[PDB]
Write a protein that binds this ligand. Sequence first.
Ligand SMILES: Nc1ncnc2c1ncn2[C@@H]1O[C@H](COP(=O)(O)OP(=O)(O)NP(=O)(O)O)[C@@H](O)[C@H]1O
Ligand SMILES: *[C@@H]1[C@@H](C(=O)OC(C)(C)C)C(=O)[C@@H]2C[C@@]1(C(=O)OC)CC2=C
Ligand SMILES: [Mg+2]
Length: 359
Amino acid sequence: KRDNNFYSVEIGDSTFTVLKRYQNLKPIGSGAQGIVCAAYDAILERNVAIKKLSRPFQNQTHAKRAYRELVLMKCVNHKNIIGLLNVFTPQKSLEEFQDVYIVMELMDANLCQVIQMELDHERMSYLLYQMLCGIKHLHSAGIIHRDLKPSNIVVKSDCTLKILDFGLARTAGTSFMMTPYVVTRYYRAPEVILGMGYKENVDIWSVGCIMGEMIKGGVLFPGTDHIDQWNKVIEQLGTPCPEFMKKLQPTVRTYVENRPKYAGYSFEKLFPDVLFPADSEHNKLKASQARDLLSKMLVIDASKRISVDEALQHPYINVWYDPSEAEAPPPKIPDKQLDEREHTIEEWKELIYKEVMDL
Ligand SMILES: Nc1ncnc2c1ncn2[C@@H]1O[C@H](COP(=O)(O)OP(=O)(O)NP(=O)(O)O)[C@@H](O)[C@H]1O
Ligand SMILES: *[C@@H]1[C@@H](C(=O)OC(C)(C)C)C(=O)[C@@H]2C[C@@]1(C(=O)OC)CC2=C
Ligand SMILES: [Mg+2]
C-alpha cells in the first residue's frame, strides 16, 4: 500500500526516496558505496547526512560490506565512531526491497579539509589521540580496518573526530574488485599493498601517513599506481630488511628485491623543524616527540611497528589520555558469524532487510 510518509527527489542521476521529515536534500558526497546527501531532519531539528545504498544484496561483495556497516554502526556507541541516527527502506516488502537509507549526524568537515589548516601540536595530538581511540575500540571487538583514510574521517566544530567506515573486513587487499570508482591507496600499509598477512597495527601505518600529511601539508606516499606507491615508500624510508623480504610471494619478491637499494632518510630530514610549530622550548621538544612517534608508526616491517596501545601511551599523545574514551567496553556484536558467512543473493537480501527492520 502507498505509505504517504515518503517523497522522492532527484539528486544528480539517481533518485532519493526519503521520509518526509528529511527536507532540503543536497548532495555532499559520492563513491563506490552510494550517494550521500545533507538534509534537515524536521523531527530531530538538526542536520543529518543520508546515504543511499542501491541494491546492496546484489552480490556478496556489496552485501558483506553493507551488512557489516549496518550491524556495526548500530551496535557501536563511541565518541570517535560515526553514530546511526536512523535507517529505513522506502520499499514495503522483502519482495520489493531495493534500497537502504542510512541517516547519520552531519559533521562539519572531513579530515582532508582539517589537514589544510595550520595545526599546532595540541590540535594534531588531539586529533591523533581520537583516531587512536576509535581504532582501539574497533580492535577491541576484533574489527581491523585496513583502509583508514582522511576522506573517511570527519570532524565537528567542537573538535570531536569520528571514523566514518569500518574497513576491508576479511577480503584480500590485492584481489580484483569490480568497481568503476577510483580507490585511494596512499594510506594502506605495506602488508596490505604487497598482499601479506597482517595484525592490528596494520592501522598504525595509516595513522602515521595521516600524521605525516598533517605536518607536511601533502600526501606522503602519493603513488600514481601500485608500482609508484611502493617506490615512494622505499625512497623515503629505506629498503626493508631481508627477513621481511622472505615473507613475499615469488613474483612480488623478485620485483621488490630487484628495486634499487635505498638507505632512506632520517625523520629529521623527512620532517624538519621548519614544518612544525617551533618558536619555544615546549614546541621544539614537541617536534622531537612528534618525529619519535612518526619513526615508530612509519615502519615498513609491521613486526617492528608500534601498537595502538603503545601509541596511546607515547608522550606526544598521552597528554590527552582519558580511560573513558581509551578503555571503553568493547562493542558487543550480536551476529557471532559477522564476516564469516557466505550467502546466496536471496539470503543476503533477507539478512539486510531484517537488519533494517530489526526482525
Ligand atoms: N556523516 C557525515 N557527515 C559529514 N560528511 C559526511 C558524512 N558521511 C559522508 N560524508 C561526506 O561524504 C564523503 C565521502 O562519502 P562516504 O560516506 O565515504 O561514502 P562513499 O563516498 O559512498 N564511499 P567512499 O568514498 O569510498 O568512502 C566524505 O569525505 C564526507 O565529506
Ligand atoms: C579543537 C580541536 C581541533 O582540532 O579543532 C579544529 C577546528 C578541528 C582544527 C583540537 O584538536 C583540540 C580541541 C580544540 C577546541 O577548541 O576544543 C574546544 C582545540 C584543541 C587543542
Ligand atoms: Mg566511505
